[PDB]
Design a protein around this ligand. Structure first.
Ligand code: DGD
Ligand code: CLA
Ligand code: CLA
Ligand code: CLA
Ligand code: CLA
Ligand code: CLA
Ligand code: LMG
Ligand code: SQD
Ligand code: HEM
Ligand code: BCR
Ligand code: BCR
Ligand code: CA
Lengths: 37, 39, 35, 60, 96, 42, 37, 32, 52, 35
């Protein structure tokens, strides 16, 4: 039903606060830190 | 090339943003050579 | 600064500055779409 | 040691080829199957050539 | 406004209905080519999009079926005669 | 009809590849082509 | 259907003033910087 | 200064080497 | 030894750079849903102590 | 005073490009408001 993606209006977060689409996404948070490390 | 009349805004925000960022980068290079350098 | 590698002394001089360019790239991507 | 020009000059132009071609392959669903292998010949060339500049560091 | 959907957010029981439809979109296209009439494509597609509007993405189906069409006509580059037949028939599947 | 069978005789053996061309642009995290349930032979 | 806008207005003169003396002065600054004592 | 020129050229190549990954995705239709 | 310690960090960033682009673009979005190892929920506290 | 001549030569090619490239629409905008 969901599976919106990364927009303003599916998650309630804007273009800034530009990670909090990845609080609950487990897999792409790993790609945040490994690109950061 | 006209769907809209030119390539869009984020492409021209880059090269006219980098064109700003090179000129203020040219100013900090000019603190180190030239007449105000004391070198 | 090693003798064999040498000539590179142009290219490896700039190599710290590219993590500043990794931040600004993100802004360009955001400007692209979704914002 | 005149080989140490052209080996590492080939490395800097094939690793410039990896700063750009890896998000293209990763970036599209359309070409992923076709392009998936092309990273294992892509990075597999870049792996053994970084190995080959390693042995040619000590030899000169 | 289209983004490609991830399988992990979608669901394995939700996508096993999805992936068999992609074979089924061309299995009826192969049926309609030997049937000589595109009626069976143009009658089993009307309102399929407003059936699957809740579960599947409507924007993801158009881009999938277009490149399903474009890759199929790339296989017909040798005969030079049936490629314009299937271009007429795949365009019924896109426009319906 | 002899030509119309030949269009089906190019698409039937190529239909297993053509979904892997199709689904790889709309799906990301998995090899969806092997995530299918094809109808078995016997 | 369409809307036609005028090219020159008061703001075409408002934005060119403090931009025609901007990039003519940007150039002057660069020129001043290259030269030395 | 040839060395300086080369260094500057290296800096050049590499800055807009960034956004040519972005525009090539944004015009071939890759999901950005 | 000062030269080889940075090239061993310069080459180790590229293979650490492949992970952060595979797991952010091509890889799975639902980290948790897999082989019952990683992912988590931030609330199964027995799992979150195992990460530490 | 030859040096004032070379510095206004980019000033006159600035407006010299403004004649040829837009100015067909400018006289139609000078045709506007009936004056
Ligand atoms: C917003 C509202 C407005 C606020 C504006 C006011 C607050 C910000 C001010 C920033 C603008 C001024 C920047 C400095 C100006 C400059 O051109 O500075 C010039 C100087 C260098 O000066 C030169 O320094 C030289 C040093 O010489 C020495 O070195 C030479 C070579 O080694 C020789 O050896 C020589 O013998 C030796 O003496 C000489 O002294 C030169 O004469 C002298 O021109 O560059 C440097 O300071 C380099 C260090 C950078 C300084 C600024 C960093 C911090 C800025 C804020 C960052 C905020 C980020 C926020 C992000 C969100
Ligand atoms: C370990 C560090 C860490 C991590 C991983 C996070 C993680 C997060 N923070 Mg965060 N934060 C931290 C430390 C951290 N925080 C600290 C220490 C501060 C205080 C400065 C903040 C302040 C901050 C803000 C202000 C808010 C968050 C938010 C968020 C969330 C969204 C992030 C986002 O969209 O980025 C947004 C990124 C940007 C907008 C880019 C801004 C870039 C800045 C301006 C650069 C600063 C200058 C920099 C040094 C460059 C200098 C260049 C030089 C040439 C001048 C995410 C969960 C948001 C939240 O609550 O969501 C849940 C939120 O609104 N963060
Ligand atoms: C340390 C910096 C950092 C890192 C690692 C990330 C990482 C991420 N962010 Mg992010 N972000 C950052 C800073 C960062 N951000 C800042 C500063 C902002 C504020 C402007 C944002 C704002 C932001 C938003 C608003 C969103 C993200 C999202 C994402 C995630 C997925 C990206 C995506 O789907 O687009 C994929 C992007 C592309 C395909 C464009 C191509 C770009 C390429 C991949 C860059 C790398 C190229 C590189 C040079 C090649 C390396 C060479 C190789 C050999 C290794 C990803 C994990 C998104 C998310 O939550 O995911 C759903 C999202 O919605 N971020
Ligand atoms: C101990 C190591 C450490 C820690 C804890 C952090 C922590 C962080 N880094 Mg960072 N970084 C480090 C080392 C570290 N960095 C090093 C060594 C490099 C290479 C020079 C970088 C390069 C880097 C880049 C390129 C980016 C980060 C970003 C971030 C933020 C991650 C998430 C986010 O969007 O927050 C949201 C954060 C905010 C809304 C504002 C935070 C403002 C902080 C307090 C200022 C300093 C940021 C960071 C610590 C230093 C980066 C310096 C420079 C490259 C910009 C977070 C503040 C991302 C970011 O957000 O940039 C600001 C980002 O794009 N880092
Ligand atoms: C923080 C780091 C981190 C974490 C937690 C993960 C986690 C994961 N990755 Mg992954 N990955 C990472 C970094 C990371 N990755 C990096 C940097 C890359 C680029 C090389 C990859 C490339 C990658 C691919 C290509 C795949 C994964 C996959 C997976 C998943 C399944 C793991 C599995 O079955 O492996 C099996 C584990 C082994 C066979 C054991 C090998 C262990 C290594 C090679 C030995 C060396 C360990 C080392 C000595 C420890 C100290 C490190 C030291 C050098 C600092 C799992 C969620 C899979 C996935 O997403 O599912 C489809 C997958 O196919 N990863
Ligand atoms: C098999 C268990 C295992 C092992 C061996 C590691 C090992 C590591 N993880 Mg890891 N991780 C694990 C499970 C594990 N993790 C799980 C289950 C998760 C949740 C999905 C994570 C999530 C995770 C993240 C998100 C990150 C790591 C990071 C790291 C590295 C720490 C670097 C350091 O401190 O240098 C120690 C110095 C020496 C060993 C020398 C290291 C390679 C960090 C890193 O830098 O990745 C490489 C990082 O960002 N891990
Ligand atoms: C395109 C549109 C642009 C619109 C701009 C409209 C006008 C804005 C005018 C405001 C700027 C005024 C200061 C000019 C800066 C300058 O001349 O630097 C010119 C200077 C001159 O550089 C010097 O040149 C000399 C030549 O011999 C010497 O060699 C010196 O070494 C060299 O430093 O360079 C710098 O100072 C570098 C730092 C620049 C950053 C200054 C920021 C000041 C901000 C003040 C707050 C105002 C609010 C701004 C943000 C809003
Ligand atoms: C140069 C002069 C610019 C300032 C000015 O007075 O413009 C006044 C008018 C725009 O007025 C008027 O400008 C009006 C815009 S508004 O009224 O300011 O909103 C517009 O509605 C009207 O069509 C237009 O004639 O500009 C012209 O019509 C002629 C421009 C000069 C042509 C030769 C170069
Ligand atoms: C003397 C030199 C200049 C000439 C000949 C010139 C020419 C023009 C022209 C012809 C237009 C109308 C655009 C069109 O309808 O085609 C215009 C508008 C504009 N110019 Fe310039 N320009 C000059 C200087 C500048 C400078 C230095 C800047 C700042 C970078 C600038 C920024 C703009 C902007 C922002 C507009 C749009 C403003 C508006 O129409 O409301 N111009 N210019
Ligand atoms: C996935 C996974 C993970 C992770 C892992 C990792 C992260 C790893 C890393 C790894 C790495 C990080 C690797 C790296 C490598 C590198 C290398 C191997 C390099 C090499 C090189 C050489 C050998 C050479 C060198 C040289 C040169 C170049 C020249 C000069 C001289 C010399 C010789 C020095 C974990 C555990 C989490 C979990 C499980 C699974
Ligand atoms: C402010 C802003 C802006 C602007 C920006 C700019 C100005 C710029 C950007 C961006 C950029 C411009 C970025 C860049 C990037 C880059 C990159 C990302 C890179 C990559 C590469 C690398 C990493 C390297 C590699 C290598 C090595 C390692 C060594 C040798 C050589 C080679 C090449 C191989 C805009 C308005 C738009 C928007 C808003 C914000
Ligand atoms: Ca160097």
């Amino acid at each position: 039903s969901y599976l919106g993606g990364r927009d303003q209006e599916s998650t309630g977060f804007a273009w800034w606060s530009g990670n909090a689409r990845l609080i609950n996404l487990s897999g792409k948070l790993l790609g945040a830190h490994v690109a950061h490390a | 090339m006209s769907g809209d009349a030119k390539l869009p805004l984020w492409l021209i925000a880059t090269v006219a943003g980098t064109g700003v960022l090179v000129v203020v980068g040219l100013f900090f290079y000019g603190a180190y050579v030239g007449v105000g350098s004391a070198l | 600064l090693p003798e064999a590698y040498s000539i590179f002394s142009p290219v490896v001089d700039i190599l710290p500055v590219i993590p500043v360019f990794f931040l600004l790239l993100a802004f360009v991507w955001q400007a692209a779409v979704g914002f | 040691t005149l080989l140490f020009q052209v080996l590492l000059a080939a490395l800097v132009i094939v690793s410039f080829l990896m700063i750009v071609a890896v998000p293209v392959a990763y970036a599209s669903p359309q070409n992923w199957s076709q392009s998936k292998p092309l990273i294992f010949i892509g990075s597999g060339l870049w792996a053994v050539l970084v190995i080959l500049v390693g042995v040619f560091n000590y030899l000169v | 406004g289209f983004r490609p959907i991830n399988v992990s957010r979608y669901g394995p029981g939700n996508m096993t209905k999805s992936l068999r439809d992609l074979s089924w979109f061309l299995r009826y296209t192969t049926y309609a080519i030997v049937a000589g009439d595109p009626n069976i494509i143009a009658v089993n597609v009307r309102g399929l999009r407003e059936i699957i509007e809740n579960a599947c993405s409507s924007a993801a189906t158009l881009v999938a079926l277009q490149e399903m069409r474009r890759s199929a006509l790339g296989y017909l580059q040798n005969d030079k005669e049936g490629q314009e037949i299937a271009l007429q028939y795949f365009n019924v599947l896109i426009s319906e | 009809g002899a030509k119309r069978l030949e269009i089906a005789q190019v698409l039937t053996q190529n239909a297993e590849l053509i979904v892997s061309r199709a689904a790889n642009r709309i799906f990301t995290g998995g090899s969806p082509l092997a995530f299918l349930e094809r109808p078995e032979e016997p | 259907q369409p809307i036609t806008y005028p090219i020159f207005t008061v703001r075409w003169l408002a934005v060119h003033t403090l931009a025609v003396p901007t990039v003519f002065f940007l150039g002057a600054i660069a020129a001043m910087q290259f030269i030395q004592r | 200064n040839f060395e300086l020129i080369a260094q500057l050229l290296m800096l050049s190549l590499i800055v807009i080497a960034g956004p040519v990954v972005i525009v090539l995705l944004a015009f071939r239709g890759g999901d950005l | 030894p000062y030269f080889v310690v940075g090239v061993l960090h310069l080459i180790s960033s590229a293979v650490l750079g492949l992970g952060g682009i595979y797991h952010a673009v091509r890889g799975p979005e639902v980290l948790e849903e897999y082989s019952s190892f990683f992912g988590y929920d931030w609330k199964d506290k027995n799992q979150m102590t195992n990460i530490i | 005073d030859l040096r004032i001549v070379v510095v206004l030569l980019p000033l006159i090619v600035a407006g010299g490009w403004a004649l040829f490239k837009i100015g067909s629409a400018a006289i139609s905008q000078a045709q506007a408001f009936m004056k």
